[PDB]
C-alpha cells in the first residue's frame, strides 16, 4: 500500500535475539531505519550532541514536557529525569525515516493507551529453558540474578500470547528465521520508507 510509513514498536522476553534482529535490519536498510531521540535533564558527556544521542533539556522544561505529553513513558533516576516526548517520534519521521521503539511489554501497554498507534511487533525465544541454557553458558550471569530473569521471561511469555498486545508474534526458531520473518512483517513499512512497489 503506497502511503508514508509509520514508527515500529519492538518487544518481548529479555534477549530473545532482538538486539541482533535489529542491528541486522539497520545495518542492511541503511539509515531507512532510526530511534527515537530520549529527552533528559543530564549534562552531555564528550562525543555527545543534542538531538544525536539524547535531547538536552531543563528540570524545568522537562516537567513542561510531561505537562505536555512526555508523562507516557517518564522515568527518575539518581536526581536525573528521563523520557520519550512526541517530538522525539515526530522528529524522524520528519526526516522521512521510519521511527523504532524498543521496549517492555508494559512498554507496549502504554502505548496503546496514549492516542499513538505504531505497528506492534514481539520476539519470544523458541522455549523458556532454550533462554535459560543461553543465559547460563555466559559468565556475566549468577543464580540469584538468573531466578528474576526467568520469571520475568514467564510473564513475558504469557503476555506475548496476548491478541490485543501485538499485530506480529515471532519465535527465535533461529536467527536467520526470525530475522525472514521479521524483514516480511515490515516489508510494507519497508515499501513506504523506500518509496517503492504496490
Do not use: W
Not at 119 to 137: D, F, K, M, N, W
Not at 170 to 186: F, T
Request: proline share 5%.
Amino acid at each position: 500500500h503506497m502511503s508514508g510509513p509509520r514508527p515500529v514498536v519492538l518487544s518481548g522476553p529479555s534477549g530473545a535475539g532482538k538486539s541482533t534482529l535489529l542491528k541486522r535490519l539497520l545495518q542492511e536498510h541503511s539509515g531507512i531505519f532510526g530511534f527515537s531521540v530520549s529527552h533528559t535533564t543530564r549534562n552531555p558527556r564528550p562525543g555527545e550532541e543534542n538531538g544525536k544521542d539524547y535531547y538536552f533539556v531543563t528540570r524545568e522544561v522537562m516537567q513542561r514536557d510531561i505537562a505536555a505529553g512526555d508523562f507516557i513513558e517518564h522515568a527518575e533516576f539518581s536526581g536525573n529525569l528521563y523520557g520519550t516526548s512526541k517530538v522525539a517520534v515526530q522528529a524522524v519521521q520528519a526526516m522521512n525515516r521510519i521511527c523504532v521503539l524498543d521496549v517492555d511489554l508494559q512498554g507496549v501497554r502504554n502505548i496503546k493507551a496514549t492516542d499513538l498507534r505504531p505497528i506492534y511487533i514481539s520476539v519470544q525465544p523458541p522455549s523458556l529453558h532454550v533462554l535459560e541454557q543461553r543465559l547460563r553458558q555466559r559468565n556475566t550471569e549468577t543464580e540469584e540474578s538468573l531466578v528474576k530473569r526467568l520469571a520475568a521471561a514467564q510473564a513475558d511469555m504469557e503476555s506475548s500470547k496476548e491478541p490485543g498486545l501485538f499485530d506480529v508474534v515471532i519465535i527465535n526458531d533461529s536467527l536467520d528465521q526470525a530475522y525472514a520473518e521479521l524483514k516480511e512483517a515490515l516489508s510494507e513499512e519497508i515499501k513506504k520508507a523506500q518509496r517503492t512497489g504496490a
